[PDB]
Amino acid sequence: MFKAVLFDLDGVITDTAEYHFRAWKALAEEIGINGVDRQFNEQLKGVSREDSLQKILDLADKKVSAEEFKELAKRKNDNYVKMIQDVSPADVYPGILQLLKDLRSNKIKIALASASKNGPFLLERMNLTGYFDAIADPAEVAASKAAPDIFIAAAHAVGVAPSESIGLEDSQAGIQAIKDSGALPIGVGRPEDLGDDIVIVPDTSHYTLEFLKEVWLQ
Ligand SMILES: O=P(O)(O)OC[C@H]1O[C@@H](O)[C@H](O)[C@@H](O)[C@@H]1O
Ligand SMILES: [Mg+2]
Ligand code: NA
């Protein structure tokens, strides 16, 4: 049986991928870059703050100063942080709280493998911190998603090998990171976005312990 579940946060535990998108789109348009639509944003999900800004700047081959780059990232974060202040336990996606309780009851470790430095704050907002055995610090890894490092770190933080873990993800970059870690990915979203080569569920209510067990078996 699998021994750990490695959770992405944004777009898996709650609808904060929507808020990252809105904040990045607003920032892009302030600097005159209009290509950040929902389709392009699939390339941004799971990606670090700095890599997200760089991918946006790459759209118009746009060149800002180092000072401007830092200020733009800060501006986006300040906006995002304001948008999430009213997140509450009511915003936890369907099925997720039950899954956490069921994993815990079955002595399966629970780790966060989010690229977001706002992850710990969001778990507190949602009253979820006590369910997590570990949070992998996205600033500590040498390589961010789509590199596997954060998933490897999350597994190791709970004393489990990635090969004994399931990873839950809503993003292309994160699914790739799970694949390259050795853990088993189960995506949530559209195969059109996430691929036709791994198990994908249409919504988080499908993330039941019972379903995870069967995926593991097969
Ligand atoms: O800017 P933060 O909060 O550190 O988040 C970093 C990244 O965190 C990931 O969880 C999100 O999918 C990305 O959209 C985001 O860019
Ligand atoms: Mg995500
Ligand atoms: Na406008």
Residue numbers in the entry: 1 to 218
What does the literature reporting this entry say, word for word?
For complete catabolism of both trehalose and maltose, the isomerisation of βG1P to G6P is catalysed by β-phosphoglucomutase (βPGM, EC 5.4.2.6, 25 kDa). βPGM-deficient L. lactis is unable to grow or has impaired growth, when the sole carbon source is trehalose or maltose, respectively. βPGM is a monomeric magnesium-dependent phosphoryl transfer enzyme of the haloacid dehalogenase (HAD) superfamily. The active site is located in the cleft between the α/β core domain (M1–D15, S88–K216) and the α-helical cap domain (T16–V87), with closure of the cleft through domain reorientation occurring during catalysis. Two phosphate group binding sites are present, a proximal site adjacent to the carboxylate nucleophile and the catalytic Mg2+ ion, and a distal site located ~8 Å away in the closed enzyme.
Taken together, these results confirm that βPGMP146A can assemble a stable and wild-type like βPGMP146A:MgF3:G6P TSA complex in solution. The 6-phosphate group of G6P is in the distal site and the trigonal MgF3– moiety mimicking the transferring phosphoryl group is coordinated in the proximal site between D8 (atom Oδ1) and the 1-OH group of G6P. The donor–acceptor distance and the angle of alignment are 4.1 Å and 174˚, respectively (compared with 4.3 Å and 176°, respectively for the βPGMWT:MgF3:G6P TSA complex). The catalytic Mg2+ ion coordination also has comparable octahedral geometry to the βPGMWT:MgF3:G6P TSA complex and to substrate-free βPGMP146A. Together, these data demonstrate that βPGMP146A is able to populate a cis K145–A146 peptide bond and achieve full domain closure with concomitant formation of transition state geometry. In the crystal structure of the βPGMP146A:MgF3:G6P TSA complex, which mimics the transition state of the phosphoryl transfer step, the K145–A146 peptide bond adopts the cis-isomer and the sidechain of K145 is able to engage in the active site. Hence, conformer A remains the preferred route for phosphoryl transfer in βPGMP146A, despite it being ~1000 times less stable than in βPGMWT because of the trans to cis isomerisation of the K145–A146 peptide bond. In addition, assuming that βG16BP binding is diffusion controlled, the increase in Km for βG16BP in βPGMP146A reflects the energetic cost of the trans to cis isomerisation of the K145–A146 peptide bond.
